[PDB]
Design a protein around this motif. Structure first.
Motif, PDB file in Angstrom:
ATOM      1  N   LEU A 242       0.807  -1.227   0.000  1.00  8.44           N
ATOM      2  CA  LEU A 242       0.000   0.000   0.000  1.00  8.44           C
ATOM      3  C   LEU A 242       0.847   1.287   0.000  1.00  8.44           C
ATOM      4  O   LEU A 242       2.079   1.226   0.046  1.00  8.44           O
ATOM      5  N   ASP A 243       0.182   2.443  -0.073  1.00  4.47           N
ATOM      6  CA  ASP A 243       0.861   3.744  -0.063  1.00  4.47           C
ATOM      7  C   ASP A 243       0.574   4.374   1.292  1.00  4.47           C
ATOM      8  O   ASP A 243      -0.463   5.018   1.483  1.00  4.47           O
ATOM      9  N   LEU A 244       1.485   4.174   2.236  1.00  2.00           N
ATOM     10  CA  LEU A 244       1.285   4.687   3.573  1.00  2.00           C
ATOM     11  C   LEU A 244       1.379   6.215   3.632  1.00  2.00           C
ATOM     12  O   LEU A 244       0.758   6.854   4.487  1.00  2.00           O
ATOM     13  N   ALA A 245       2.138   6.785   2.699  1.00  2.00           N
ATOM     14  CA  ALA A 245       2.297   8.223   2.606  1.00  2.00           C
ATOM     15  C   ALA A 245       0.915   8.859   2.447  1.00  2.00           C
ATOM     16  O   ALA A 245       0.502   9.683   3.260  1.00  2.00           O
ATOM     17  N   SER A 246       0.239   8.447   1.373  1.00  2.00           N
ATOM     18  CA  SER A 246      -1.085   8.917   1.005  1.00  2.00           C
ATOM     19  C   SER A 246      -2.151   8.436   1.975  1.00  2.00           C
ATOM     20  O   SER A 246      -3.188   9.073   2.142  1.00  2.00           O
ATOM     21  N   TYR A 247      -1.880   7.300   2.612  1.00  2.09           N
ATOM     22  CA  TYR A 247      -2.814   6.743   3.591  1.00  2.09           C
ATOM     23  C   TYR A 247      -2.854   7.602   4.858  1.00  2.09           C
ATOM     24  O   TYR A 247      -3.895   8.119   5.211  1.00  2.09           O
ATOM     25  N   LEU A 248      -1.719   7.792   5.523  1.00  2.00           N
ATOM     26  CA  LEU A 248      -1.676   8.585   6.758  1.00  2.00           C
ATOM     27  C   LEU A 248      -2.202  10.006   6.635  1.00  2.00           C
ATOM     28  O   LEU A 248      -2.926  10.479   7.517  1.00  2.00           O
ATOM     29  N   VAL A 249      -1.830  10.697   5.572  1.00  2.00           N
ATOM     30  CA  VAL A 249      -2.261  12.062   5.384  1.00  2.00           C
ATOM     31  C   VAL A 249      -3.725  12.097   4.998  1.00  2.00           C
ATOM     32  O   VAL A 249      -4.469  12.958   5.464  1.00  2.00           O
TER      33      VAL A 249
ATOM     34  N   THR B  69       6.379  10.559   4.005  1.00  2.00           N
ATOM     35  CA  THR B  69       7.129  10.033   2.871  1.00  2.00           C
ATOM     36  C   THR B  69       7.597   8.588   3.149  1.00  2.00           C
ATOM     37  O   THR B  69       7.718   8.151   4.304  1.00  2.00           O
ATOM     38  N   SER B  70       7.835   7.841   2.078  1.00  2.00           N
ATOM     39  CA  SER B  70       8.306   6.467   2.190  1.00  2.00           C
ATOM     40  C   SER B  70       9.114   6.163   0.936  1.00  2.00           C
ATOM     41  O   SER B  70       8.748   6.564  -0.172  1.00  2.00           O
ATOM     42  N   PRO B 241      -3.814  15.633  11.592  1.00  2.00           N
ATOM     43  CA  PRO B 241      -2.863  14.590  11.208  1.00  2.00           C
ATOM     44  C   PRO B 241      -3.354  13.853   9.955  1.00  2.00           C
ATOM     45  O   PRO B 241      -4.559  13.773   9.726  1.00  2.00           O
ATOM     46  N   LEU B 242      -2.443  13.317   9.147  1.00  2.00           N
ATOM     47  CA  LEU B 242      -2.816  12.596   7.923  1.00  2.00           C
ATOM     48  C   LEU B 242      -3.402  11.197   8.193  1.00  2.00           C
ATOM     49  O   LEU B 242      -3.478  10.763   9.346  1.00  2.00           O
ATOM     50  N   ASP B 243      -3.831  10.510   7.131  1.00  2.00           N
ATOM     51  CA  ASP B 243      -4.394   9.160   7.242  1.00  2.00           C
ATOM     52  C   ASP B 243      -3.356   8.208   6.665  1.00  2.00           C
ATOM     53  O   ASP B 243      -3.305   7.987   5.451  1.00  2.00           O
ATOM     54  N   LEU B 244      -2.518   7.658   7.536  1.00  2.00           N
ATOM     55  CA  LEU B 244      -1.463   6.778   7.087  1.00  2.00           C
ATOM     56  C   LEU B 244      -1.999   5.440   6.568  1.00  2.00           C
ATOM     57  O   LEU B 244      -1.385   4.804   5.705  1.00  2.00           O
ATOM     58  N   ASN B 251      -0.508   4.200  -1.636  1.00  2.00           N
ATOM     59  CA  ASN B 251       0.835   4.588  -2.120  1.00  2.00           C
ATOM     60  C   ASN B 251       2.042   3.612  -1.995  1.00  2.00           C
ATOM     61  O   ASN B 251       2.735   3.354  -2.977  1.00  2.00           O
ATOM     62  N   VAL B 252       2.302   3.086  -0.796  1.00  2.00           N
ATOM     63  CA  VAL B 252       3.452   2.190  -0.584  1.00  2.00           C
ATOM     64  C   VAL B 252       3.255   0.713  -0.934  1.00  2.00           C
ATOM     65  O   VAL B 252       3.994   0.151  -1.758  1.00  2.00           O
ATOM     66  N   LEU B 253       2.249   0.097  -0.303  1.00  2.00           N
ATOM     67  CA  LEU B 253       1.941  -1.319  -0.474  1.00  2.00           C
ATOM     68  C   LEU B 253       1.228  -1.725  -1.769  1.00  2.00           C
ATOM     69  O   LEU B 253       0.388  -0.959  -2.285  1.00  2.00           O
TER      70      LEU B 253
END
Ligand SMILES: CC(=O)N[C@@H]1[C@@H](O)[C@@H](O)[C@@H](CO)O[C@@H]1O
Ligand SMILES: CC(=O)N[C@@H]1[C@@H](O)[C@@H](O)[C@@H](CO)O[C@@H]1O
Ligand SMILES: CC(=O)N[C@@H]1[C@@H](O)[C@@H](O)[C@@H](CO)O[C@@H]1O
Ligand SMILES: CC(=O)N[C@@H]1[C@@H](O)[C@@H](O)[C@@H](CO)O[C@@H]1O
Ligand SMILES: [Ca+2]
Ligand SMILES: [Ca+2]
Ligand SMILES: [Ca+2]
Ligand SMILES: [Ca+2]
Ligand SMILES: [Mn+2]
Ligand SMILES: [Mn+2]
Ligand SMILES: [Mn+2]
Ligand SMILES: [Mn+2]
Lengths: 253, 253, 253, 253
Positions: A242-249, B69-70, B241-244, B251-253
């Motif tokens: 997943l995209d944790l960057a876009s997820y957390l924010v 960021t990741s 705060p963002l939604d990680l 974004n990451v996974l």
């Protein structure tokens, strides 16, 4: 790809499945019983799950989902009282009913591996059970047993907020959980590999489970202040983290 | 609210600002020089930033952005060679030019606090500089100086992939960085408070900076295999705060 | 897959490339010149692009990106003045400079197809040019010429807000643009097939271009009140349309 | 703010609540009955909803949610058979049971306004019912009655795919629905103002409802090929339209 996600800052609603003493009050999720004056109660047990089942993987296609969750918990113990028993984020079978109370957090029946339990949980154990627990208060990854396969010490800041973030990357089969006490600028992390397709069913219910001590002086509260969840199931075997960057924010921050 | 984000798995493009020996080859981002046979080179320095500036906060409104960021890095050292000097994720002033090479990672000029440097960086130091470094290989948060204000030991797995995730929550003013070596199931985390509005300008350029040793035997490669970034700037002082959860999966996974 | 996106509700910043009379004031994007008392000015021309280039497709892999944008414009004409000349959302070559003013909206040089112009634009034409325009005010898809390949009548509500949403689905090679005047409850839509890889370069700059009339009585303002953009470029030929559901809610609404 | 969303490209699962003849086969959602050889069947009725309820607004806070959905339907009629009766996207009370079949699409009981029905639906009517329907096949917004409050003609391309996108912006109280037949390059749009808090309950179930004709020659299939949904509920009265840009790309395209 199939995707499901949600983010709740406020709690009133039928969107959850409550069991035991779990309740919703003042918009926050209270997993265990509390007297009117606010003090916790012994021998309590409450569970809470999202009303919609999530597909962790698909046997037909070979696709395994990558997911992630984050929530803020507030654990408080009365003045001179000891902590017990803890809270756990769990992935259980869809129709599942509570299990053993006390040190079993309402999710497991024994400390021996039993594949048929089909349950995986990330626990935040606030009382060391001599039979299977490490000497300290810890965070642990439980796979079909109350005896974690990996743990990390944890300094529980009484009454202060805890920000938890758990992720499962299908690409590396790695489960990582981290905790942060903003108030104390302290932070913990733990990671271990888990063959999810072998431990859990295709569909599961995600949520929390908490318990208080069985005695008068082993009590604490379990309030969930917010909760986010995101899951992505691909079409082919080819996993995609997943995209944790876009997820957390877009969800936590 | 204003939002900017991106996620690159492949690297060819004008979307980046390269400085020094930074280059793009085979779709991956190579921050430092490498000979044709592939071995690293000494006295190297490369930086790389997203071509679009990001607003960290707004003086007029009092809004401070929460971001995350990741990225995946692969650091390799030739057979019998030692590691040096390291890689750093940095937030620098928009027009900024490289700075001191070697142990200064190309981002700082001294080990003494100098607010006017207007630079904040998360470093992954692979060589201990007796003047300001801890005895080990570490991860550290540098605020306007090469002397981190907080560090954590780190066991660099030579040639193996590293998954990094950094986040800044405006609500708690907390900067958290974590690293994971999937291959070794090892994981590190570090967190500290940073008053971002005081250390950096309203607009900054985000990217990487790396350097190799100044001697023949202190070399390593710095390949960025993927990169994600997300930033959210609110309208009022009220930070969010963002939604990680949604960030990592989207974004990451 | 590579992804880039942004969403601005406020405008101050270096994140944009302004050309001509384009300016940023009071946080809104003003594409054309306005005197101090606020009235529009004749023979004006302004353009504005995101400072980061976007990759529309990749020749090597055969991947074509699916993208989508949404913005709110407010076009106003002084009391007894006529409308002219219009605003256009455009995809131009990275280094591109303004082109013909007036009825050419600053993006094209002629009304004859010229593949080498490498420009595609969705126009909101407020003045009918007898040489190539339909009889009424319209919305149109221009492919390497000021003569749209498809148009739809449009009843411009003077001074009222306009909500535009444009999308390009690589799977069906379809470009769809829609407009809505919330105030009047009116809505327009137009769709046509465009072979994007043949009309534009691999990398383009996305933004707006507007012009006012060349005479004293043909004037209007061009204010962009907000802007969102999202683009996704796959790895293989297999295109994947975007998720407008998640896009609009996470970006427009 | 509270957010819920999902995106399904494949259909097998307990994540849905099926009623009537609705079924899941070959991963697509088949709302009405089909014999083994594949031909549709008369007097059929099927409904399907997401297993998790969605909060459209909150009476206590005054917050109203902005949401958006997109799905692909394929309607086919046997060789010499006529079309009937149609499919509708609906927002119904949580425990709700099917209603009148045939021309009532299984969602309404009469053509007279009845606030107590607490149902709002966007219909794609394939058979004109002389009592309340316009002369041609249309798209319409139904508010507590089978008699739409607004409609638009629609040229149903037999057997070809239909891409629908519906959105509700709380800021302008506007409901907009659009349809596109990629195969023909045709597109339709319709928009009208709806005071959602007055027509529906705080919590609703979102999904589809379809019916076939009551006679032997009025039949067609209703296959949903994919479905996306996103909803956002703010904390204060201050509504915030969604980001369709980021929604479509992250969900539809
Ligand atoms: C197995 C078990 O439930 N053990 C419990 C332990 O979890 C804790 O609640 C304690 C409180 O005094 O009471 C028992 O020992
Ligand atoms: C201050 C400085 O650049 N020190 C460098 C150190 O960073 C490392 O590159 C070393 C290699 O032999 O050479 C010097 O000591
Ligand atoms: C070709 C061209 O630019 N024509 C322009 C037209 O677009 C409009 O601006 C008009 C105003 O009086 O002046 C000219 O005719
Ligand atoms: C009110 C009603 O259900 N009318 C239905 C109409 O909708 C259609 O199904 C037709 C088929 O022959 O049968 C009836 O007339
Ligand atoms: Ca225990
Ligand atoms: Ca060093
Ligand atoms: Ca014109
Ligand atoms: Ca009808
Ligand atoms: Mn334990
Ligand atoms: Mn250091
Ligand atoms: Mn035109
Ligand atoms: Mn109708």
């Amino acid at each position: 790809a199939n995707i499901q996600s949600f983010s709740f800052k406020n709690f009133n609603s039928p969107s959850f499945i409550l069991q035991g003493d779990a309740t919703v009050s003042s918009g926050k999720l209270q997993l265990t019983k509390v007297k009117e004056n606010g003090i916790p109660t012994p021998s309590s047990l409450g569970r809470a799950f999202y009303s919609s089942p999530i597909q962790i993987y698909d046997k037909s296609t070979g696709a395994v989902a990558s997911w992630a969750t984050s929530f803020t918990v507030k654990i408080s113990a009365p003045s001179k009282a000891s902590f017990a028993d803890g809270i756990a984020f769990a992935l259980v079978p869809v129709g599942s009913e509570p299990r053993r109370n006390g040190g079993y957090l309402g999710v497991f029946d024994s400390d021996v591996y039993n594949n048929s339990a089909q349950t995986v949980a990330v626990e935040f154990d606030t009382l060391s059970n001599s039979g299977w627990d490490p000497s300290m208060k810890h965070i642990g990854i439980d796979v079909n047993s109350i005896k974690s396969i990996a743990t990390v010490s944890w300094d529980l800041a009484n009454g202060e907020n805890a920000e938890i973030l758990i992720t499962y990357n299908a690409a590396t089969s790695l489960l990582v959980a981290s905790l942060v006490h903003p108030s104390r600028r302290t932070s913990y992390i733990l990671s271990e590999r888990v063959d999810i397709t072998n431990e859990l069913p295709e569909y599961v219910s995600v949520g929390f489970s908490a318990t208080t001590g069985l005695s008068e002086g082993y009590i604490e509260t379990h309030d969930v202040l917010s909760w986010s969840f995101a899951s992505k199931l691909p079409d082919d075997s080819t996993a995609e983290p997943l995209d944790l960057a876009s997820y957390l924010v877009r969800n936590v921050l």
